[PDB]
From a paper:
Here, we use cryo–electron microscopy (cryo-EM) to solve the structure of the ribosome from [name], a species of microsporidium used as a microbial insecticide to control grasshopper and locust pests. Furthermore, we identify a non-ribosomal protein bound to the [name] spore ribosome as [name] (late-annotated short open reading frame 2), a recently discovered hibernation and recovery factor. In this study, we provide the first structural analysis of the [name] ribosome and demonstrate that it occupies an intermediate state of rRNA reduction between yeast and V. necatrix. In this state, energy is conserved by inhibiting ribosomes via a diverse family of proteins known as hibernation factors.
A consensus refinement resulted in a cryo-EM map at an overall resolution of 2.7 Å, with a well-resolved large subunit (LSU) and a dynamic and less-resolved small subunit (SSU)–head region. A 3D classification focused on the mobile SSU-head was performed to improve this region, resulting in 2 states with either a rotated (State 1, 37.7%) or non-rotated (State 2, 39.6%) conformation. Multibody refinement of State 2 improved the local resolution for the LSU (2.83 Å), the SSU-body (3.03 Å), and the SSU-head (3.27 Å). The improved resolution allowed for model building of the [name] State 2 ribosome structure, using the S. cerevisiae ribosome as a starting template. The L1 stalk, L7/L10 stalk, and parts of the SSU-beak were not resolved and therefore not included in the final model. The high occupancy (92%) and resolution of this density allowed for its unambiguous assignment as the eukaryotic hibernation and recovery factor [name]. In [name], [name] is a 77-amino-acid protein comprising 2 consecutive alpha helices (α1, α2), separated by a small hinge region. While the N-terminal extension occupies the mRNA channel in the SSU, α1 superimposes with the D-arm of the P-site tRNA, and α2 sterically blocks the T-arm of both P-site and A-site tRNAs. Although the [name] rRNA does not contain this ES, extra density between [name] and [name] is consistent with a free nucleotide. This suggests that ES39 served a vital role in the stabilization of the protein–protein interface, and the nucleotide-binding site has been retained despite the loss of ES39.
Author numbering:
A (entry chain SJ0): 2 to 165
B (entry chain SX0): 1 to 138
C (entry chain SY0): 68 to 133
D (entry chain SI0): 2 to 170
E (entry chain SE0): 2 to 258
RNA sequence: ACCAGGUUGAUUCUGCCUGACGUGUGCGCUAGUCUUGGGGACUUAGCCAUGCAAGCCAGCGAAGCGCGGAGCGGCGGACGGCUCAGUAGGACGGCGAUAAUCCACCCGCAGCAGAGACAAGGAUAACCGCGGCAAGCUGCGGCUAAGACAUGGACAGGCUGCGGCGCGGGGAGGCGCGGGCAGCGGACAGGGAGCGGCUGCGGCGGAGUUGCUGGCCCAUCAGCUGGUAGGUAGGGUAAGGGCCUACCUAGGCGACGACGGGUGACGGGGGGUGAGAGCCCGGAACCGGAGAGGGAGCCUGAGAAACAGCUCCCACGUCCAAGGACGGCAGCAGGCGCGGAACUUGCCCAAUCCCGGCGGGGGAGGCAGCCACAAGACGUCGCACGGCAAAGGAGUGCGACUGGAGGGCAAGUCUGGUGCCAGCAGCCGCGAUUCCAGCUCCAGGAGCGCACAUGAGUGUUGCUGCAGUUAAAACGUCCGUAGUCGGCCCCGCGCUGUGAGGAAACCGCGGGGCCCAAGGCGGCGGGCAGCACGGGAGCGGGGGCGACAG
């Protein structure tokens, strides 16, 4: 039948908060994003991850913190960049699940290769270093990417370099 | 009616309370069917009959350039207000114009009294296209 | 990535594989199958004809001759 | 034709039902085959599922048993003496189930005197049944349904079952 | 609508067949053969999705035309033939003999068996009825029927029937302590030993089962297929052996205990 | 889990209005690329030109010149597709029942009449001619087939009545089977491409009935009911039944809301929105129902009260040589009409599948086109390659608007015009910080604005959780029945835990480098005041108190 879909972004409830409208834009001008939707996607993706953790810390079933909590932390470590949890089953999950609630949207915004090109001093010009991604100059290990919100992983983070 | 076995009494009672709620009162009565102008369907389209002189509610003193319009789907004669300064000369008699509401849930907007609908397109081309000159009336 | 098949005879190839892929290699076109719109009208005329075509065409032109 | 549905009926509370859909063949009934006496004519019907139901239109004889001795004959039907549901059905001599009918006594009295030759006590046990036999009156009920089976089988009335019915006609 | 449904939608197909959503609108409607539709899969699923002999129906038509497929010792040259639980698919080309059986993922799986295990199959009886002339012939759940069996064979028993011979060679009763296979339900594809039988006069006898691992579950006895007595298994067991490992056990192997 | 503006000279409230957010429907302006999905449901279940959409075959095999393919015969056309008018329970959902029932394909079993039997009888279509007729359609003659239609021949199954012990199953029996007497009745005279017929038992696949239960509004709808409620008996049906009839009882339902009405009501899986309780929606993928212009009746068949079958009536429409003949796009495109509102008279069976015993057919279906309708990702021209049923695209490969700038509300007391005019403004408001332009600036951004509807805002519907001295609101009083609520002590039921069984889609979660993403695909879960088991408490039953209860 039909393939399912979802809404990536959301809009704020009060659209003209002058306090928010510059705290958005400094988080936007740091990473040089196209629009607020690119920022509000990661602000949503970080939020329901925080909303996921807050419903695991409430849980009565300790199997749930075992199954979904280690799944959430490995999601933070492997595809994300968290890089500190042992998964020991010595309740370092609950030490780290309460570290999920302090994560910002900017914690996810740095993970994109638009930022990661700048992390190894590769193109030095973030406001138009995206021109090199858009014209296919940045190449991960064997494949070229023209999607600057690529969200690079743990293992892939060193293996980035410019190609021609 | 607060006992543990009062659910059918509470549903019977609170529904009779809810009939006094004005938002639920219109859905209960079906007033959007009683006036087929803009309630059940948006964008009523009809034939212009005459240009109307109507004066704004005081303290504001101006003259809004309304028009009577007879609808095609109903034959109802409703008055509609023309926005977008100087547009009243761009619409003529026996035109077929489309009408929209004011965003006031069926009431008058601002200084205009009685006029609950406003024109957006004349002869299936918009007034925003004519107020700036983007399109042309056929 | 290529998913390729390794047959053992040309005859099992043209039998098992679909008819368009042997048109890719060699261009057989063994069945004409005129066109879909032509084959519909050709069959739909044959459906209303009772009996053989020769009895129907003879009775038709005999009335056309008159 | 006639239907079997309750879509025309009222509800238990007396409410009238709305009749909207067209009639189905799932619930279709038929005419009463008012089976009468005459030379045998049975009607064949390809009814539901192709099975052939035979209803008797006219019907001459019935396979009637004597339950006391376990012997049977197909004696001819003479007239319906009693019908339980309506006396209209006995005036027209309509053969249905449970209809008390007057049978042909000749074939039954031949074996009945033959067993009466050996056992003399048999006639004294029910004097009323053997009273009507010498007069030639022999009565039975149809137990089969002639509109469904196409036959008029049953048993000879004897005993208190007989005196129950001869008070009814 | 109403009548014999000739078509079958892809979403309405049984999820044990493991058909994708985006494969098409329709799924292959099985023929009305030996197994019920809830407990069967067609041949045309096995020969393209499981064994992948044919990628195309034109290839699949050729395979059934040349009659190389043979299930329960009969050729069965039908595209939509319903093969069910315990039935043995034996292909003389490739010399591959498989028995259709469930998996832990609640799906049908073709389990490779030996050439000697392919000579028989197991059938759960449905009813037991004297035929005309006094022939006491029983009826299996897959629509097979056999006569002159052991009189001790009553309902819910599984019988070991030969394939190449139409007789029943082995009998397995439905008591406590028997190795059971769970055909339908939440515990589909689980192998366990029957602990208790609760009768429930009127309807739905309930069987209590603990597996080899020790996990206890309850099912209807109609969803209970005996595969062995206490000493032995009468069939080979598939991959995973019907354990149905828990989600935390799936979690603990990835990250340690 | 949010408020903000607005009653005043100022205040505190009540109170509504409006802003602020999601959603879907339409409009408007604008527009670079790609993937994916959607799209005449709402008004008109309105009207339809033209083409296409359900055909196929292996028995028999004519013409035509062994090939052949007509007709007979057979199978399907009752499925899919479309639509949502009717439907307030004939539905649907959940749980059942059918010991009250029928059956095609297919599967597994048993079987199929010795009859002259090394054998089967009369036909008819095709065809050969001769025709009628504007057309649609049809006649006469001559022959000739069968897995068509018969004949022949009864061991069984079957039917009915009566009799009647047991053996099996089932919760429960003359349900199955064996044993009886009668009356009926009743399964192979086929073939040198695989077999094909028929009878029965068991499935499968269906189907009909059916029980319990749940689900909108109106009391300015309070009493309703006559085949109505029941009994007996028969009829009828595949089948229980007031289903029907005959006779007889006087019942049946109702404030625990009957009955009647309304609905711009198909139901559900579900969807939207909210922290939640809720509120709202469900035309729309899947399931069930219903319909084919309005109807009714039916034939054939296993299955239709069929409609791309028939018969008739009605309302529209067409052709005619005037005698007659036809049409039903709520199938696919397309046209008109309707409206706010919805695409090409494209290509093809390649994929998904279905019919047919295979070569065939399939507007089911896919592919493409149209459309900013939606989701997602990304900017500011021609070869070869590549894929494709075919083409095109993907993939290598070379040569910037939209809205605003007084407050709410982010951003101008800049410039020119306008002078209570024109105009603007959801609310407050302005008449030049608000009009109309220019500039600049702000907001979102290939999108944005508007209208309508709905949710939240709203504890302004209040179960959670409102308010009733004076803001809207305690009925003049008392009695009073249903209703609802209710003292103390001392097996059944409520409640509750687990479990069964419960479709996928969906949703929640979890993976998973489709370049990312939305995804695909694979795991795991939830759903039900139905069912089973458990439960220390609670309630009944019965005694004892005698309540700052009476
Ligand atoms: Mg003739
Ligand atoms: Mg003749
Ligand atoms: Mg309706
Ligand atoms: Mg629906
Ligand atoms: Mg449907
Ligand atoms: Mg007051």
């Amino acid at each position: 039948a039909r393939p399912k879909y979802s809404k990536r972004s959301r809009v704020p409830r009060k659209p003209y908060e002058k306090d928010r409208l510059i705290d958005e834009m400094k988080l936007l001008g740091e990473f040089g994003l196209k629009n607020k939707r690119e920022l509000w996607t990661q602000e949503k993706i970080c939020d329901d991850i925080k909303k996921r953790a807050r419903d695991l810390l409430i849980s009565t079933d300790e199997s749930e913190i075992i199954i979904n909590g280690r799944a959430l932390l490995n999601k933070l470590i492997k595809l994300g960049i968290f890089s500190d949890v042992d998964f020991k089953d010595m309740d370092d999950i609950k030490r780290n699940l309460e570290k999920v609630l302090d994560l910002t949207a900017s914690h996810f915004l740095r993970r994109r290769l638009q930022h990661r090109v700048f992390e190894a001093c590769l193109a030095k010009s973030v406001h138009h270093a995206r021109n090199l991604i858009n014209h296919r100059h940045i190449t991960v290990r064997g494949c070229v990417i023209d999607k600057p919100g690529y969200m690079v992983f743990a293992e892939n983070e060193g293996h980035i370099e410019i190609n021609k | 009616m607060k006992g543990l076995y009062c659910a059918k009494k509470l549903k019977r009672n609170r529904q009779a309370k809810r009939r006094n709620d004005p938002t639920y009162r219109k859905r209960l009565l079906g007033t959007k069917y009683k006036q087929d102008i803009i309630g059940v369907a948006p964008q009523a389209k009809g034939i212009v009959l005459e240009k109307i002189e109507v004066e704004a509610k005081q303290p504001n003193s101006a003259i809004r350039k309304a028009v009577r319009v007879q609808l095609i789907k109903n034959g109802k004669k409703v008055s509609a207000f023309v926005p977008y300064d100087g547009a009243i000369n761009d619409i003529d008699m026996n035109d077929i114009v489309t009408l929209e509401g004011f965003g006031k849930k069926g009431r008058s907007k601002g200084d205009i009294p009685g006029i609950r609908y406003k024109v957006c397109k004349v002869q299936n081309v918009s007034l925003l296209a004519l107020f700036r000159g983007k399109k042309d009336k056929p | 990535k290529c998913k390729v098949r390794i047959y053992e005879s040309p005859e099992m190839l043209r039998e098992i594989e679909r008819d368009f892929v042997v048109k890719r290699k060699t261009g057989e076109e063994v069945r004409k199958k005129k066109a879909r719109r032509v084959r519909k009208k050709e069959r739909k005329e044959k459906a209303k004809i009772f009996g053989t075509l020769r009895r129907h065409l003879k009775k038709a032109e005999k009335r056309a001759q008159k | 034709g006639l239907s079997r549905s309750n879509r025309h009926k009222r509800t238990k509370t007396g409410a009238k039902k709305p009749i909207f859909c067209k009639k189905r063949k799932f619930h279709m009934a038929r005419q009463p085959s008012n089976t009468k006496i005459g030379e045998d004519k049975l009607q064949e019907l390809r009814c539901r599922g192709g099975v052939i139901k035979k209803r008797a239109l006219r019907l001459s004889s019935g396979n009637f048993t004597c339950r006391t001795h376990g012997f049977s004959y197909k004696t001819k039907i003479m007239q319906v003496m009693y019908h339980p549901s309506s006396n209209e059905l006995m005036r027209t001599n309509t053969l249905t189930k449970s209809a008390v009918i007057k049978l042909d006594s000749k074939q039954f009295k031949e074996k009945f005197d033959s067993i009466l030759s050996t056992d003399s006590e048999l006639k004294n046990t029910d004097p009323l049944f053997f009273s009507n036999l010498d007069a030639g009156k022999l009565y039975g009920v149809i137990v089969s349904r002639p509109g469904q089976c196409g036959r008029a089988d049953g048993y000879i009335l004897q005993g208190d079952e007989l005196n129950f019915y001869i008070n009814k006609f | 609508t109403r009548g014999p449904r000739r078509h079958l939608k892809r979403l309405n197909a049984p999820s044990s067949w493991q058909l994708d959503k985006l494969g098409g609108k329709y799924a292959p409607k099985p023929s009305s053969g030996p197994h019920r539709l809830s407990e069967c899969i067609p041949l045309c699923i096995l020969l393209t999705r499981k064994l992948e002999y044919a990628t195309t129906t034109k290839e699949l038509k050729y395979i059934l035309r040349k009659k190389m497929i043979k299930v329960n010792g009969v050729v069965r040259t039908d595209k939509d033939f319903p093969v069910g639980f315990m039935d043995v698919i034996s292909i003389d080309t490739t010399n591959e003999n498989m028995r259709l059986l469930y998996s832990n993922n609640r799906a049908f799986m073709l389990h490779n068996i030996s050439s000697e295990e392919a000579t028989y199959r197991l059938c759960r009886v449905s009813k037991k009825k004297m035929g005309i002339g006094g022939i006491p012939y029983i009826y299996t759940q897959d629509g097979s029927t056999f006569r002159y069996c052991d009189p001790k064979i009553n309902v819910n028993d599984v019988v070991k029937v030969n394939i190449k011979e139409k007789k029943v060679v082995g009998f397995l009763p439905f008591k406590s302590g028997m190795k059971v296979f769970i055909t339908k339900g939440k515990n589909l594809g689980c192998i366990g030993v029957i602990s208790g039988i609760e009768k429930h006069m009127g309807s739905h006898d309930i069987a209590y089962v603990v597996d080899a691992k020790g996990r206890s579950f309850s099912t209807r006895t109609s969803n209970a297929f005996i595969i062995g007595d206490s000493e032995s298994y009468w069939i080979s067991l598939p991959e995973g052996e019907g354990i149905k490992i828990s989600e935390l056990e799936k979690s603990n192997i990835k990250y340690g205990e």
